């Protein structure tokens, strides 16, 4: 069923720096995709930063991986409308603990 449709995170957020599970940002570019640029989180460490500022292996930094909507080229390299796909992306990182 074909229907019609018209028209970095670091800019406004530095949680990637101040999280106890901090992360880097990867520029994922794809011109055959809309949006063209996706920013993908990569956790910096296995452990999490503790209250002394040190990497602490009593917990783990883990990515939050989410499926999100994008638009791709149904005929490859052909900008004549496109399919609606779902891709798995790391949106950020959180700190998981064994003590719950």
């Amino acid at each position, epitope marked *: 069923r074909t229907v019609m449709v018209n028209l970095n995170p670091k800019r406004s957020s530095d949680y990637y720096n101040r999280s106890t599970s901090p992360w880097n940002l990867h520029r994922n570019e794809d011109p055959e995709r809309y949006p063209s640029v996706i920013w993908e989180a990569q956790c910096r460490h296995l452990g999490c930063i503790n209250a002394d500022g040190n990497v*602490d*292996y009593h917990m*783990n930094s883990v*990515p939050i*991986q989410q499926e999100i909507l994008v638009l791709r080229r149904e005929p490859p390299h052909s900008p004549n409308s496109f399919r609606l796909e779902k891709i798995l992306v*790391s949106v950020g990182c959180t700190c*998981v603990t*064994p003590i719950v």
Partner: single-chain antibody
Framework: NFMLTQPHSVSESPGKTVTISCTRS????????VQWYQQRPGCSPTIVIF?????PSGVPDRFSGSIDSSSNSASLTISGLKTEDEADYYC?????????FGGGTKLTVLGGSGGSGGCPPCGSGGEVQLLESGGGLVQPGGSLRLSCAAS????????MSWVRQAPGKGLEWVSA????????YYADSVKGRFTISRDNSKNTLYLQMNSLRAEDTAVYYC???????????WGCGTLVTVSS
């Protein structure tokens, strides 16, 4: 990396308290959580203490754990010993790259009999299910792929690992992988021969075993970890035999 040293065996009378200690050879013990596993003869291991001193539901409160940072050691204490406590107890901890089990301490409850125990279930209880398969007989230099089918939990949220045990011998950590599959870890003797991987859309964990050796013969267990190095649930194992 490091070793964990616990006694080969200990004996104590029923109704008394016994402590089993585990000394870490290198690295600071207080930097990494210590777990303790009970394994009865012929059974899968089961957790009795995780994160130094946490007790899962269903473990009697006569079990407790502690650490002594100055002697670089951890201890399992059993008060009010019952005959069903007779078993092999394994300590386990980790560092950023590897997981290590102690050699296992066989506890004898003096007086002979007056109880039993029984084996745990596969998956260590609850709704957690871990079903291994792929084991078989192979020639040296051969290949085998093991799989572990998981159910009852959000599979992509859990680090997983492979641990093996030759019949009559101790637990030996093999390999580990993060929930997303982006990080993998290997025991030294399997690097370059084994590959751990996972398929999160199929709830499946894999172990590709190339260049198989006679010393690779063992029951191979799938394991669910709360964080890297902290095993919470065990499968029932698949047998791999390597022989000429």
């Amino acid at each position: 990396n490091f070793m964990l040293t616990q006694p080969h065996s200990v004996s104590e009378s029923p109704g008394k308290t016994v402590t089993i200690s585990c000394t870490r050879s290198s690295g600071s013990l207080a930097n990494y959580y210590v777990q303790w596993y009970q394994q009865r003869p012929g059974c899968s291991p089961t957790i009795v203490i995780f994160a130094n001193n946490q007790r899962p539901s269903g473990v009697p409160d006569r079990f407790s754990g502690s650490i002594d940072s100055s002697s670089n050691s951890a201890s399992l204490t059993i008060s009010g010993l019952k005959t069903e406590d007779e078993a092999d107890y394994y300590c386990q901890t980790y560092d950023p790259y590897s997981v290590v089990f102690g050699g296992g301490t066989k506890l004898t409850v003096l007086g002979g009999s007056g109880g039993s125990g029984g084996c745990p279930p596969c998956g260590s209880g609850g709704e957690v299910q871990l079903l291994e398969s792929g084991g078989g007989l192979v020639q040296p230099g051969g290949s085998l792929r093991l799989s572990c089918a998981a159910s009852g939990f959000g599979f992509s949220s859990y680090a997983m690992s492979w641990v093996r045990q030759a019949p009559g011998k101790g637990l030996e950590w093999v390999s580990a992988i993060s929930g997303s599959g982006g990080s993998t870890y290997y025991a030294d003797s399997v690097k370059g021969r084994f590959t751990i991987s996972r398929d999160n859309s199929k709830n499946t964990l894999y172990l590709q075993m190339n260049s198989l050796r006679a010393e690779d013969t063992a029951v191979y267990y799938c394991a669910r970890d709360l964080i890297h190095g902290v095993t919470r649930n065990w499968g029932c194992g698949t047998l791999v035999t390597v022989s000429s």
